[PDB]
Design a protein that fits this description.
- Helix content is about 15%, strand content about 30%.
- It is an alpha/beta fold and about 160 residues long.
- The protein has one domain (about 1-160): Dihydrofolate Reductase, subunit A.
- Strands 1, 2, 3, 4, 5, 6, 7, 8 and 9 form a nine-stranded mixed β-sheet that branches.
- Pathway: Cofactor biosynthesis; tetrahydrofolate biosynthesis; 5,6,7,8-tetrahydrofolate from 7,8-dihydrofolate: step 1/1.
Length: about 160
């Protein structure tokens, strides 16, 4: 039963365009989990792939697009169903935007990694509405702005309940 994880950085409910390929700010006490994520396929929309400018190394990159693929290094899919099929028997898949992609995956998703960075400027897309009764905040950690953290943020893991 595949873990299907939405990963997004948010300013209120607006999706933030992150410089890092993976849109999270991971707390120090979860840094270990980063090692676990390295082999997990990533699924993203065409514009998100364009913004990164190359594949995330060492893992399957799946890009959803209605247009012909422009990079042999990644796998091109025309729908979220095809994208999941390409993920095969991966234990977990990371879905990383944009807004439309999150909305389309929401029903099938069963985990979210949300980085709430309120002081930043969100982009022109909103993260989809989700039902609070369906989702449990299982882990939440706030860090204040300081000399090593330019923005205060809260990293949250939600799982379906």
């Amino acid at each position: 039963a595949m873990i299907i994880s939405l990963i997004a950085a948010l300013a209120a409910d607006r999706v933030i365009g992150m410089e890092n390929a993976m849109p999270w700010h991971l707390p120090a006490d979860l840094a270990w989990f980063k090692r676990n994520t390295l082999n997990k396929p990533v699924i993203m929309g065409r514009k998100t792939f364009e913004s990164i400018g190359r594949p995330l190394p060492g893992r399957l990159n799946i890009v959803i697009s209605s247009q012909p693929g422009t990079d042999e290094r990644v796998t091109w899919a025309a729908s979220i169903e095809e994208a999941l099929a390409f993920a095969g028997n991966a234990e977990e898949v990371m879905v990383m935007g944009g807004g439309r992609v999150y909305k389309q995956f929401l029903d099938r998703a069963n985990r979210m990694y949300l980085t709430h960075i309120d002081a930043e400027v969100g982009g022109d897309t909103h993260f989809p509405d989700y039902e609070p009764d369906e989702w449990e905040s299982v882990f939440s950690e706030f860090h204040d702005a300081d000399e090593a953290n330019s923005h205060s943020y809260c990293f949250e893991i939600l799982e379906r309940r």
